[PDB]
């Protein structure tokens, strides 16, 4: 996940790096604790439904 600073400003790099780290932190924390295959599928469907329902009203 390389992001160049552009040497024009510093904040902007951290303004993009915050997003990249959040999606990065999601998978990093997922492969930390062991859940059953059914529960893993359960958690995937749970995340998809949350994201979907939020996007419906933001669209």
């Amino acid at each position: 996940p390389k992001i160049e600073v552009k040497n024009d400003d510093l904040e902007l790099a951290l303004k993009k790096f915050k997003r990249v780290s959040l999606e990065i932190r999601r998978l990093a924390q997922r492969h930390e604790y062991h859940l059953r295959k059914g529960m893993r599928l359960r958690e995937k469907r749970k995340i998809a439904q949350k994201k979907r329902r939020k996007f419906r009203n933001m669209v």
Partner: protein, 114 residues
């Protein structure tokens, strides 16, 4: 004695480590919350990560480098306090690449605490 280099900043949920290294291998200096003198639970607080970054930045600045590629690591909580600490130290941050190990579904992770 080297102008450019790499500083690995690992941020564990329990502790943090800042290693200043040559562009390829051969670390020049290292520091951590434990070596500062902080002990126990306090080692996991963003303020401590900023403190650790400040000491290593001061030490490495007297050695005389300018350009730094910042390889952020770990999944702690003070992942950005050290980042701001280096920027306030005044080193030229060139890259913000993140290299926390991510698996592709290899090895079974540990049990869930309850």
């Amino acid at each position: 004695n080297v102008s450019s280099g790499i500083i690995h900043v690992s941020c564990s949920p329990n502790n943090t480590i800042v290693s200043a290294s040559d562009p390829g291998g051969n670390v020049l200096c290292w520091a951590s919350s434990g070596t500062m003198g902080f002990k126990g639970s306090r080692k996991k607080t963003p303020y401590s990560a900023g403190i650790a970054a400040d000491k290593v930045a001061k030490t490495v600045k007297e050695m005389g480098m300018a350009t730094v590629k910042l390889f952020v690591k770990g999944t702690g909580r003070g992942k950005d306090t050290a980042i701001r600490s280096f920027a306030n130290a005044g080193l030229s941050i060139t890259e913000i690449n993140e290299k926390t190990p991510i698996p592709h579904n290899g090895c079974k992770p540990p049990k869930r605490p309850r």
